[PDB]
Amino acid sequence: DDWEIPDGQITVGQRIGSGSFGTVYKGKWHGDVAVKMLNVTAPTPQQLQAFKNEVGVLRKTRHVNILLFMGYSTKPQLAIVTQWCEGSSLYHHLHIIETKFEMIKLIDIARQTAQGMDYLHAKSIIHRDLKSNNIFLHEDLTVKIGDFGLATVLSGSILWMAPEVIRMQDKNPYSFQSDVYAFGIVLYELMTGQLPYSNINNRDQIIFMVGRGYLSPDLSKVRSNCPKAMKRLMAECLKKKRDERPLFPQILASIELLARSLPK
Numbered sequence: 494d495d496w497e498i499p500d501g502q503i504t505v506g507q508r509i510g511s512g513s514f515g516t517v518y519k520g521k522w523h524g525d526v527a528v529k530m531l532n533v534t535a536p537t538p539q540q541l542q543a544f545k546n547e548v549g550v551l552r553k554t555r556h557v558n559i560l561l562f563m564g565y566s567t568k569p570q571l572a573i574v575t576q577w578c579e580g581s582s583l584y585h586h587l588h589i590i591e592t593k594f595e596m597i598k599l600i601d602i603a604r605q606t607a608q609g610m611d612y613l614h615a616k617s618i619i620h621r622d623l624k625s626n627n628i629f630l631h632e633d634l635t636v637k638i639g640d641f642g643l644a645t646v647l648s649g650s651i652l653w654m655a656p657e658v659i660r661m662q663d664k665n666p667y668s669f670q671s672d673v674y675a676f677g678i679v680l681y682e683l684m685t686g687q688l689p690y691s692n693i694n695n696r697d698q699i700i701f702m703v704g705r706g707y708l709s710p711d712l713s714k715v716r717s718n719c720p721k722a723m724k725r726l727m728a729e730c731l732k733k734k735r736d737e738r739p740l741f742p743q744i745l746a747s748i749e750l751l752a753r754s755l756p757k
């Protein structure tokens with residue numbers, strides 16, 4: 494039953510990039526897989542911990558909108574194996590190759606991303622790094638949320654970081670609520686086709702002002718056939734005070750409703 498994979502079996506190919514605590518490859522194990530390797534030379538107790546936490550969370554997931562965990566390896570190196578998604582991150586489509594989705598499709602991506610977040614929270618999993626880089630479009634029609642290195646039961650993202658998280662105001666800024674905020678910023682990416690704060694060229698200036706509440710995403714920029722309900726949901730998700738943010742059940746219902754009204 495265990496998910497350990499005997500050394501020798503996974504075949505590592507292309508280095509394709511990064512993921513929390515490690516390097517991502519395309520690989521082969523009973524077909525195409527993504528492999529993240531957390532390693533070289535011998536693991537830190539740091540990395541050992543990261544790897545054990547992440548495998549632990551992954552094996553609690555089974556759902557079409559969560560990237561499928563397939564197994565792990567310790568013996569050449571710490572390695573996590575998942576299904577391979579052909580396509581790319583939502584980030585790559587939106588901000589690198591400028592794929593232009595239709596509103597109907599954008600709303601669907603939002604709805605499935607909602608659907609996954611709702612699954613995770615129902616199982617008490619806080620992703621803590623939702624952002625469009627960790628949303629993979631498999632076969633271009635299905636959202637898989639990936640990368641659980643930072644999830645709970647020399648690095649920083651921040652464009653998706655809620656103000657509470659930015660100003661590390663205690664031990665625990667993280668919550669379903671901070672996840673909901675990150676989702677708010679990916680609704681912003683879907684609807685505006687843009688990263689937030691694009692007219693401020695200073696990272697520090699952004700970190701500060703979102704921290705103090707001076708800055709917040711310019712919701713004017715939402716393309717013109719974004720439904721009102723969607724602009725309105727985005728603003729709920731993006732509330733500076735976390736207690737005013739909706740949880741994912743609500744978020745989900747709101748998106749499924751505005752979709753039923755939408756093909757008209």
Ligand SMILES: O/N=C1\CCc2cc(-c3cn(C4CCNCC4)nc3-c3ccncc3)ccc21
Pocket residue numbers: 509510511512513517527528529547560573574575576577578579582629639640641642
């Ligand atoms: O735990 N996190 C994991 C485990 C497996 C895993 C795979 C990826 C992953 C990262 N990229 C990026 C990397 C930076 N440059 C652009 C491509 N593309 C994928 C990918 C994932 C699944 N199918 C196809 C591709 C990320 C995280 C994790």
